[PDB]
């Protein structure tokens, strides 16, 4: 779509250090 | 009974997930603009104000 | 003393040239030629045999070459005894319209701080009979205490309700600085505090002054009037040797006023667009108020916080010149939550097991811990749901829940309000109360009945009631 | 006296005419007594920041040049006084007997007079010492958010050299500097209270640099302390500095220069923050052998809001400094205290400035901390004992052995005895929450039944396979009848 | 030399007055009086005959009037084969206490940047041993090299690799220029060196050449450090037709320097608050340090990234100024994985199928595909669960974790760190074991024995080990 | 909007003496001070043109000031000055619901309660759309 | 980097005037401005030490009129002109794919559609990294 919106990419689950990262990095 | 049973639930969960992130992501989204243009601002004050005390 | 002639006039920035002897700096300068009292403060001496100063009332009308009188001292106001029951302005005048306060000694607004060896290391727990505050962060005794909050969160409501519990009781005097906020709050104050009889307009038996800087005001009368406040304050603290509780209300008032001149006193602006000189002279104002050996002065101070936001200069710098800091937050006053206190924020420095005890500590700190695990878990509940968790995180769920819900207290200001009696709680029920809670004795009980109640007797009485 | 005329004095700003022989950056002597320092050098007028309040000063007023460039009374009869920024007593027992006068800008140690860390700087918490060592002459940012307890680490770093000071090996005696920097008058004498109670003030000289005190005093306060350390540092003797609230400076350093009309930057703070902190910290090393053999250690502390890291001074500082202790909120509010983040707290080892009867417990609990960090993350338990149930319990279990209380610094043979008890795994059958409850009665039961041990542990300096079959009678016999 | 006067001292920029000829910009200027030396770098022409002077070192004592020589040209610093082994300063006075550096040729360190007839075409590969470096990014003979990272993540440990592999090895001298570092680290260089033989203080075969301006220095002498070092090095490159190393500690500081004086010598502040003249300073500094047609300088810069964040202007300007570029990730260094080379942001532009060959080029490529899909699927992870993916998923996840494990390399020079003795991987066992791990050959063997190890016959070995202790 | 920036910023003043009147006579008034966010942008617009610092979103650090005179200037007067008011219902408009944003916590800040409404409830057709969970008067 | 800015500055114009050659003769030219963002912080450098007024990011208000006054060059002249074209193919480097920075939006609103490239593509095996979806031709 409209370049201008933020676009998410691969690793940002992770990147983000919050709890579901941290949930993956243990599971 | 318990695999139909536990199919709809599954696709109920997720459809309700993906509603909570939809209101998170809306919330976050307001948020970021907020941010980004109080960033913009932020800058053109210090550059104006190393400017005038020149 | 010495007359000079006003030179410019931009907004509460007067630029007068003195003939001769230039008045030091914050002398207090009184423009002759004007209806009402209009004092000047001298601020910088710019040079040229020219002083620059800061208006305590309105400029309007000044015009260039308009004579102004040196009076010799800074800004003085009357102070005493007399002053307990009267209302006063930045400059000392009585405004409440009972006749002129006839002091036998009148004090500087400007003084130095008490010195290191001078102040007291004394901490006791001011029970407030609030909740939260005397679990989580304890009041202490003679200790300068911080309401932070942003608009609409309750900090008056807060610190109405420190009046009622404290201040009625409190053997010594008080004395309640308005800063930068509502003038009708403090019509109401002042009539209801007539009623309650602190302020006794017969005899002189009143316990509680008053100086009033309210945000009609313009901003130098603003960034002074808590130093008025603060000195009448000083004076029962040295010369009478009495305790006094300094109630200060939106101290974030006093450094919004220096902003606002400091652009017209000749300033580069700091971040944001603050004075640069922020942290100086919030640190002369705060260090004054402090106990001493010779009296003390619990200090319980409002400041706002810009946009509910706590990195902002002015409530950021605020945050090292209290004992206890009471945050509160919106969001928890969204949930319904009054008082809004935030649980994890909110400090003190006499949460000692020393200090406070074992038993008040070990309970305090796991109430901040289940709490805690609580905010840990609200992304994974937020998203999945909660079904997608241990029942023992199930467990610390539900428990936080019904300890968030605890924390809630009925106020005695609040209710015309919600409609629901008082409730003051003495410290001991509300440490045995989350003792029961943490435990898990009232897991059975619903969440619901937690809310907005006493001790934790009313929460059984409302659970059982929620048939 | 080559003097001049106060054009304009502002908010503590005079813009002396004249000083035609004033040097820069020296201190001059204004009528009413004030002093001042010259910063701005301008073809006309000096602009000269007073240190103190700048309402005695008014236009006019003769400034005498005092000669010499701004410098501090140094040396060890400051111990056990609690000065200001220029020297002066403000404790109230009397004049600072100093003979030597350093100047607080001086030049750091260069690449020559310096020698690899080796000396450890034990700091009494167990945390510290044993995941995130520090040693003598290594720079240690002590960064975290409001109310974590940086101050905390650093009164107890402060009260644990008590057992070295009061021993008789001036090798090991390490005199100590506190610099309070902008923190208010009542909590800088409740540090002394607590130092006084503890007997820690008679091997400290406390710099304070307050709120009220002006905003050159609070710059120029980290200078004076770390040129009284230097005092120790190049006479053989070692040191340790506590810069307290280092971003205190940079905002007096900000309102300093802003009033100096320097031109701002980045935040408003002047472009030379990053200098302002670098000539402090570069300044702390540990001198060669030819030099003296001396060392000072420095701790500033950084309040970062929000838990912000990424912020100006706290990159700045951080970047400066050899290893940084994370204190964070979320752990505080968790139940860990003292609140370091081992998993983001690095430091490094200082070649070996780590005592080996520490490093033998130390590194098999760092692999273990760091196994169950990276498996107990969840919270959302399914099933496999063997693999994590075994490694989670086992850090659980360290986890409660590094919670220590305050002002209770431990000594570096009991943290040896606990740690070890910990990780051999003869307190994994040890309830969770009675961990504390073991540590505390454990290092009773040891410091008076096996103070031997203790000493040999000590002595020694390693634990020897000898000295381990004795730590394992102890363990095993006080774990079979810890609970009665 | 039309002797000039001091007007005004403000911090590090010092403005004199030159009633006779004004010296031209770039000009060293002496301060007379003081007791050490004090060398003023004109930079403006403010006019009225005075000149705004960056000072190079302290301003302190400095009394307006005070008499200033011109030197006549830019700051000259010793410079041969006599400033092997010896430290330097940025105005080339001998700081390691052995004497004056007694060298025929002077040069000054500012000085005109190679023409682009001058450039060299050719790419070689320099195997430096590092398994991410020379599989993913490999570095090139003559080429620049770049070091990005935050702070703590491994640079000044990877620099010091790269100077134990390469420098000690390579016949040619080298030069170390350490811009705004700590003063700690520049001794431990120092020593180290003398034990490793690279600095001899009693024979004449030093193969290294020390240039320091540490952080403590001012702002001033932080901004000139790198350019004496790169002078010493093109006089190893330009009259002595050798090869060199420059090893630059966080060039960085070279733009930070900058940033802190131009406030005070008038600029308006530009993005962020770096100086306007940033991209132009950094090239100018930058297209010095190349390898010319008469000789090539392999040059290793350490470049600090400001709180990790690479869109930041100092960093992201010399990206286009290197070859070869080597990120590295405080994510993966959190991890444990070390060095912490982030395996999808290095770039070389020598990884070309042509140029490090097909087999080269085509496992290295698939390891970083393999690690893209394995950033994929953690998202995934994150919600279904890992018992949940593919099988096809599974064996992708592990084979990349694996791979991650690979990278890891234990460093000699931090085996004070890890406690594992350093290992060097020849190219083609990288190459080698790392296509072994994409096939799946090493599918059995698990995941903890690919972590610290040299060779795939370490990591096999390994396992063994873990087997018997099982 | 056509009308001068100076010219939008006397306005709210201009309308606030003129119902003083009727409060110092005795007499009841009601002033609604409609788009006051407008004014505060018309008074940044004179203050950056009179090269005043800006602070935060730019606005002058006064604009709490602009506001707080006006509002305070709306009370009930005792029996003894006549027993008027001046009854106030000042106008901000958020954006995206941004009722923490400057203006609007600043506005929140002076008056003695808030009636919000919300653009769901408005789409959703409950109309009027008023937050009876936020609205609140003192 | 080592010629000064207004080299820099001046180099993309240099090369358009030498394209407008063919295009103005009946010959058809393409035109490449690798980092055009370069040329805009040679042109920042200039207009800054020129004391010119700052603006966003420090860029001078003009920076959009440099840009549009040298892409716009780029045309398909008519028969009677020659018929010759002059295809521009400028470059911007985003950072992290910030789009809506002052020079790419600036680029992005002068230019007939964009080739947009994701590092994520270019280690996913997709080489060309070409974004089908965000690229566009107007
Ligand atoms: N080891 C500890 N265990 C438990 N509580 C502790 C510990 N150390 C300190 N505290 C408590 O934590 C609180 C904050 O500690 P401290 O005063 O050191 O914080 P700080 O970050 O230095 O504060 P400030 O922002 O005022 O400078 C105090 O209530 C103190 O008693
Ligand atoms: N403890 C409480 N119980 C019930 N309502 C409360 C409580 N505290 C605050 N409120 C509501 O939230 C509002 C907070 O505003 P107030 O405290 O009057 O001014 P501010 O919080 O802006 O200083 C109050 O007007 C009141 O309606
Ligand atoms: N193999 C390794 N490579 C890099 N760093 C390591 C390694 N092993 C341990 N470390 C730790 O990582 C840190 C990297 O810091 P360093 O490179 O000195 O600073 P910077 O990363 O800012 O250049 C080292 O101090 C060390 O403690
Ligand atoms: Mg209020
Ligand atoms: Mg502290
Ligand atoms: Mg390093």
Redesign the pocket.
Known sequence: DTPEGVRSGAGAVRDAGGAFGKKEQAD | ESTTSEQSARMTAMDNASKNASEMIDKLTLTFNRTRQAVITKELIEIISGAAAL | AATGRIVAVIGAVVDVQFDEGLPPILNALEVQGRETRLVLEVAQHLGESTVRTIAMDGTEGLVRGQKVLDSGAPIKIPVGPETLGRIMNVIGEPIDERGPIKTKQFAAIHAEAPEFMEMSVEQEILVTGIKVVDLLAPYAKGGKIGLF?????????????LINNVAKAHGGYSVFAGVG?RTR?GNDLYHEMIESGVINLKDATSKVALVYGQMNEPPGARARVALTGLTVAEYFRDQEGQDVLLFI??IFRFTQAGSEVSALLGRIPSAVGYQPTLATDMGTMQERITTTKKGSITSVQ?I?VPADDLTDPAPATTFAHLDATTV?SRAI?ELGI???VDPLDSTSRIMDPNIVGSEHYDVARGVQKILQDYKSLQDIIAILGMDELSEEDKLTVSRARKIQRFL????Q??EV??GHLGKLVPLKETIKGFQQILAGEYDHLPEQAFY?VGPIEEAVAKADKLA | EETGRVLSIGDGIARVHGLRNVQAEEMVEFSSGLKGMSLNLEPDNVGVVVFGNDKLIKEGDIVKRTGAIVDVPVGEELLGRVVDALGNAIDGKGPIGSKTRRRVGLKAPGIIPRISVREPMQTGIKAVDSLVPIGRGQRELIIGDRQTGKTSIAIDTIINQKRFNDGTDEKKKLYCIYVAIGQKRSTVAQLVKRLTDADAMKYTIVVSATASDAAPLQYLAPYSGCSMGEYFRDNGKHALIIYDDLSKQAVAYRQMSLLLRRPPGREAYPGDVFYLHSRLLERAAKMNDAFGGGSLTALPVIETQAGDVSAYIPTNVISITDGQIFLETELFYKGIRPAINVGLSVSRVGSAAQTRAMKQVAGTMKLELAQYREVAAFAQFGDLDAATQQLLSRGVRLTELLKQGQYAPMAIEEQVAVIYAGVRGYLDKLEPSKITKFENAFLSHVISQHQALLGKIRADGKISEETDAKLKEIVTNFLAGFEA
């Open positions: 909050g942003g608009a609409g969160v309750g900090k008056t409501v807060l610190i109405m309700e906020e709050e209300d939106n409002a706002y509160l006053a009054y008082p809004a809630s207290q009925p106020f200001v609040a309000f919600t907005m």
